[PDB]
């Protein structure tokens, strides 16, 4: 029922208040390590790999 | 093996009374009069495999079996 | 409200571990500053709570 | 005074006059363990209590003879540095001298025979260090006392909810070290049944009837007797005056010839009181009143005849005209009574199980261990070895005295086994108990926990281990052959040193104390949990443990206490609460004579607090001792309440009592919330210093002791001048008053460099001493890892302002400028470990080399041959810091592969990337490259460099110190040769190498001179002993688990900044997280010009009622404008003799200050150098209880050229218009936490899955994802969200053909949902299969 999942973060929160209600902040090497697949689909649809 | 394991046990314990130091494989090797890589090799299968529900952690809410690596390993480059 | 009137006045009642109140509630407030004595009659239902 | 004082004076605002000062923060760990270690064979104490209650032993029938004499604890093989690095327990072998005596068969008393008296190696007890820290297998780690049941007796009530309409039950257990729970658990019917170790009720009588006692014996031993009598055959009472008292009268109560009462009459005082004055001697009673009063005699027939009545019978009236047809005329019965005496031993005696004494001793053996139909011999063993037996039962005259000071006894001094008379008192005291005569104690009383401490505990582990090894030695001993069979092989150390080493790191108490602070050591030490064997668990507890009583008052601290589930179970001890020889808590407290107190210490026990008066040290108290407003508010008996003057005999020393060593560093508690105090210090506990310790602003006045007792700073054993300070060590020269003949008068501090804590922080003994200045005894001469001048430094000051920016500051949260990091101000070292270890498996040892394959030259362009990188490599996150590749087995490719290396050069053989790399986001340089090796291995170039590395600083350091220490002690010879004569051309212009041969005429100077030659001969020794120490430590072969070929282990030492997302928290529990690094150009700024550092959030003081931080922010607003006087004097340079004017007006502005110090004394370097150090901020004190009012801190901001309001009219930094309000801004001295982002940000992304049940896994050191939990599946299903519950159960985690086919579909762009069956449900199918049920899918 309560099960670890991948492309799950632990990362503590902090305050973006130049954002709108949809937005929320991420980092970029938790955004680079975290959507590893995405990242390698993009840059082989894109020709850049 | 079990009897020369029990032997080396015993030696060990021997030394340990005879020294007060922790026993090393050259004394209990050259006292059982075996070469000291059989005497590692012996010493290596020590005991019984740590089970999977002792308390690694602070507390009882995360046991064994949580730390784990695959052996059968699907790597971003394996899949 | 209570936060304030705790603040600025004086405390109302705390928590006895029995289940009582104590007969003597604390006379200062915090910004005249609580005794030991009344730190510890202020923790006791703190800690209870 | 002394000398380390003059630089930062720590102004304090103590308006009471302290008379004991603080005492050792070590108590209970180290006076502890030096009672448990020391030569005490007086006292049986410590390892001699354990040793004298199981040792003399013997064999079977008089045959052998066991004893210990002449026990010694050998030489500690190891030092604190190298097990520390290598991972050994710290320990020495404690080699006892057993002497095994053999009785002689003829003579009836065997003297000698054969007297084995050989020293025999018994167990690895670790050592406690001069920090109080025990490293076993390289972690640092600190045992916690144990806050247990007391032994003896302990009196519980209920809190109801166990039996309906009232009726309370009042139960009593008996607590002994070891062994089984005599409890007295009550019956809603009243019969007080006897339960063992939490096993069925018993009825009372079963363990009565087996002390040979019989019916009429045990009732006449807990009751008085009522004698009625039948004179000439008429019905009469022998009334005793105790018995009829607050009783109704059911007859015409009166006397022999005059009517007293009437049936059915009160019997008040009155009736009593005539009576006792009238007459008492015979009152005749209806047959009725006896009908209901049972008897109490096994009344028989006199002259042939059984038993007509036995024990507790029934009487009726015709049993009454049988007992008046035969028997005698004195009758006695049982006294019957509501309130007074109850006839419960009666109930429990008309539902016996059995009567005999066989049977009853049997109606237990079934009790205890059911299955088993005993003997009378078997069952009589085990009732001796379960309740009268030594090797089970022992209280050591600490119990008993809680037994006899809880059962109103006077005896001191009792044997730990528990006599026949000891369950006759505490039934007496049950019965009394359950009739309302007598106070009852309660769980949350502290005389009832005792402090089981790390020697007591320790004690208790080695003692089990005696046990053990007794049961080994019992059937060792007693096979014969005992002339080849001397003690040492008799004696097993597999059992004693696994019970030693199973305590020490692997229980519930042993935890990693964070090396972090020394803050966090002193509050780890004095830290007071209750968890493992004997106290309760997190999970069974209640609200009684965690909340606290008034007799927590100065004992158990109720601040410092972790926030999660054992919110009141893990306590803390307070500073001046020390332990006591029975094991109790003490406060020290001055003794009031009528109302003049004096200023001597007498400490009092919790449970003989309860019959004082304590008043507190807030009280108004004047210089010779009296009490000034003549009304104080005093505690007694565990309430509170006004109190007179001569009523109070003790007072309270110091006004930070109640508090712990971590909670006394927590400044304006007097105006502080309990609740974010508790937090606070917690987060205090778990706070890490920065690169440079700056220096405490706002202190209170314990700064001053904490770094000197915490034992990481260089302490002062012998106090002297300065002689030459390095960055790694400090030599100072020892004066002539504590200079000893023995020594050579030098006194080298070998200061720890940057070692890893448990932590993954970095501890660093910086030297804060200048050249050439006299440091006294205690003082300071290194602070450490986050101490400045023996200051607590525990972060680091700055401006903080208590206002909204652009919503930053939201819920509570950190808004910093540039300058945090601009000026390196919160950077941190941080040294972590990560050794790279080399299995040996089946396949091929594991080889270091540098040829790795798929992988860049660039990546093994800071590697050597042997990859390993060099010393101060600068690595980034993701590089290989060492390559440790493994022999792989020919793994069977796939066909695509093959025809890959078919067509290319690639030929990947059995070389394997599998070195462990740097974790991705940690940057850093390595400072230590560890390499430890199995014997008959060979080593490469970069273990022999590394160890070669390693004897030079062993022979170029300890060199240097000989060199040192040798020109110390030919200063001392010259000094000599200077007192008894002068020549200034033979002695001095003479070579130093032939001053030892030299000498004047005879005399002690020259005796001394002789003295001090052998010394240095004993020193030349003792340095090629030293150096032969170091040849058999450094290059020894390191005996490390086995199967491995070689351990290289590095040490990563980052600067961690103050990134966005760290964690860090003030004095006062208004933690937060870093929301954004802010230029400091948008950060707000005062009139003055200076921008300020920190935004804080001032919505989180009215609900959390921290007002004490805002105190806090204006005295520190007033120390930094003192602070920028003392800069705007000093940069001119314009005169000297102002200053000492001015910080002089400074340190006096109170009623009255605890230190009336005064700068005219000083020198002018002394003054200048404090002045200097005033520079960076103004240190001042200020206590917990006893701390400044708002108008001296209005007179310290009216002194420091500010506003009296203490909000300072602000200027914006983004908009640069003045708001309409002034702002609140000042110093807050804020902390560096140990939850940093690079310790927090921690992701996931197909790494490292499980075997189990094909699972990611947990933490960032395993790299594992966060669990996502069954109450966010019930809310993302409360949403209604099905696709992405079907991924994050199914496809993302559970599937293994499914995850690898999400994979593939999402590198390739297909975005599509492609479920299936998950491998973790039919794991639970497969489970359920084999547990014997029959499941399948339709």
Known sequence: LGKRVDYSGRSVITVGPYLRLHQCGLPKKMALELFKPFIYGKLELRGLA | MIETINKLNRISRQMLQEMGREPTPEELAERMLMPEDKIRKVLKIAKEPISMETPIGDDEDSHLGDFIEDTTLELPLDS | AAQIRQLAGMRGLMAKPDGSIIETPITANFREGLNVLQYFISTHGARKG | YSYTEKKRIRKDFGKRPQVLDVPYLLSIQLDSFQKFIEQDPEGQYGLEAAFRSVFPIQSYSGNSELQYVSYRLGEPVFDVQECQIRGVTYSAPLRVKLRLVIYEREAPEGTVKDIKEQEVYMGEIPLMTDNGTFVINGTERVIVSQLHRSPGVFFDSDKGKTHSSGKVLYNARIIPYRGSWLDFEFDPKDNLFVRIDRRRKLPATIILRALNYTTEQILDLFFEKVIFEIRDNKLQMELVPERLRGETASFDIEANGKVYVEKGRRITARHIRQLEKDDVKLIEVPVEYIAGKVVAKDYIDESTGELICAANMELSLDLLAKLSQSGHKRIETLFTNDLDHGPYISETLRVDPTNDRLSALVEIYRMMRPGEPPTREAAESLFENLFFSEDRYDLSAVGRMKFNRSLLREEIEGSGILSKDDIIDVMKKLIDIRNGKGEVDDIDHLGNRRIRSVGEMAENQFRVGLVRVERAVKERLSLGDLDTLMPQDMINAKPISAAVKEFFGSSQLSQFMDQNNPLSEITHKRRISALGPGGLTRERAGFEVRDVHPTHYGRVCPIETPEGPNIGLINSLSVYAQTNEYGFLETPYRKVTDGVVTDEIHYLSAIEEGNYVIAQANSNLDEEGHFVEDLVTCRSKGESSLFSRDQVDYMDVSTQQVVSVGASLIPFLEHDDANRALMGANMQRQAVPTLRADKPLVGTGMERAVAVDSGVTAVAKRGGVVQYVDASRIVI???????????????????????????????????????????????????????????????????????????????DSILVSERVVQEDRFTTIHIQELACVSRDTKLGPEEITADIPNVGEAALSKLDESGIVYIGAEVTGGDILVGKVTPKGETQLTPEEKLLRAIFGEKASDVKDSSLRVPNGVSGTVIDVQVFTRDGVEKDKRALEIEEMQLKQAKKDLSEELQILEAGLFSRIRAVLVAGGVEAEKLDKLPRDRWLELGLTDEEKQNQLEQLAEQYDELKHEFEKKLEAKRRKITQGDDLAPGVLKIVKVYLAVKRRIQPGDKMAGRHGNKGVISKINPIEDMPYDENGTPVDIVLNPLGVPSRMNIGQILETHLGMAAKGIGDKINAMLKQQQEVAKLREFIQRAYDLGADVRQKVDLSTFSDEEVMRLAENLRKGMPIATPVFDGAKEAEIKELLKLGDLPTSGQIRLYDGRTGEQFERPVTVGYMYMLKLNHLVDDKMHARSTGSYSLVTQQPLGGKAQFGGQRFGEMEVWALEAYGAAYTLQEMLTVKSDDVNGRTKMYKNIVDGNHQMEPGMPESFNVLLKEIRSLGINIELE
């Open chain 4, 733 to 811: 020269k020892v004066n002539e008053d504590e200079m000893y003949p023995g020594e050579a008068g030098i006194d080298i501090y070998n200061l720890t460099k940057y070692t890893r804590s448990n932590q993954n922080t970095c501890i660093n003994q910086m030297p804060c001493v200048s050249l050439g200045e006299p440091v006294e005894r205690g003082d300071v001469l290194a602070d450490g890892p986050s101490t400045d001048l023996g200051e607590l430094a525990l972060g680091q000051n700055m401006r903080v302002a208590f206002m909204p920016w652009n919503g930053y500051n939201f819920e």
